[PDB]
Amino acid sequence: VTERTARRSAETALFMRDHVLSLVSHDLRSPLNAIHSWAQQVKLLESIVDTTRAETKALALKRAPFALRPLLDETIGDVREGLAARRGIVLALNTPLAAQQMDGDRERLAAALWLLVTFAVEASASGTTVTLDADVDTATLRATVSWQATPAALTDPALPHVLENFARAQATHPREAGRISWVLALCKRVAEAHDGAFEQGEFADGQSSTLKFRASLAG
Amino acid sequence: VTERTARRSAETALFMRDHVLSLVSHDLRSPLNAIHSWAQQVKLLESIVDTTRAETKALALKRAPFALRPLLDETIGDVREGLAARRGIVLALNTPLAAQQMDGDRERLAAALWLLVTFAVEASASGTTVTLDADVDTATLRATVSWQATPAALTDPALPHVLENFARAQATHPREAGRISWVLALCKRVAEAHDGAFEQGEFADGQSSTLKFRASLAG
């Protein structure tokens, strides 16, 4: 395990814990009122809000121009050495990007793309091809990972893994409407911090699954 | 910022988010009942419990013998390059340990000692000496960081920093009885996972502050 893989793993887990806190910050609202509709000091709520709001402010502070294509190649290289090669997964990069630049938080985008690809690899069986597609259109960077999914591979103890065991287990769980697997929180947070969006498709039988990442170019 | 510093920073923040979840998992018990003593679906509680319990099981799985003294020297070297040198803080190592070994989770202990020293550095003014004392006694590893504290340095925007801004701010807050500054959660978690203990002393005026870490040798 390289230092880079361990760093990316810890970042992923960090953002997943933020995601869990934000869900908690949200979901306790309704069953509380049902008890109180029969006829939680907000200060506890606010000190979790302060944590998530701090992370929110962290994700907006570092924007600087960088070359998109070396970032894509670094992503492929890092995931290949971290997990794809030892899982027998072929990584493919499809992009026309050569000299294009983006004014962005390069390190956070790097973490987001790493996780976008690593998640697909974790959910792939030996011999599967995971493809990272990436391009720009007007004001938007678009990165999509597409692959034929074997979601049982996420929790297979005979296979090497990089992501946390409980995160991998949680990712096989049926998703509530509009909600991501917790472990993808970093992709969602970084996308939305760049005035973008993140979409986790379902695990599709007989068809490719997709993760779709978008980020504004000049934010 | 080296890869090692960024990895340690993300680990620190990860464990701090676990700590916040565990506090939330605990503290909502009492104000809820005061509402219900006038005359929160546990499933939401349990899915945070599963997260913390997973981390708990992770911290018990990797024990292997390693040399204690190179771990101490690596700690000093990493914090020197990550923060102490650029803050004008002198680091001192006081230990009789030479060849002693410990059957432990070397990477987690390394993160814990890094944070033990880095926290003291963050809470030091230029020219202060931060001392790491370390020894073994019977079944126990004991590591203590002692220093003359300037807690205002934690939040001084003119000084370089490694730890998260909101974590540094939270650490200046008055501590409830028996509770640590959230940012030290990694030290506490790793100590207790090694059948040990962690003690954060107060910020002492005219006297040294201490952080005391203990871990069982052969767990």
From TrEMBL, chains A, B:
UniProt GO molecular function: phosphorelay sensor kinase activity
Broad enzyme group: transferase
Superkingdom: Bacteria
InterPro entries: HATPase_C_sf, His_kinase_dom, HisK_dim/P_dom, HisK_dim/P_sf
Protein keywords: Kinase, Phosphoprotein, Transferase
Enzyme nomenclature, EC number: 2.7.13.3
Pfam families: HisKA (PF00512)
Domain Histidine kinase: 23-217
Catalysed reaction equations from the record: ATP + protein L-histidine = ADP + protein N-phospho-L-histidine
PANTHER family: HYBRID SIGNAL TRANSDUCTION HISTIDINE KINASE C, TWO-COMPONENT HISTIDINE KINASE
Protein name as it appears in the record: histidine kinase
Organism (species): Paraburkholderia phymatum (strain DSM 17167 / CIP 108236 / LMG 21445 / STM815) (Burkholderia phymatum)
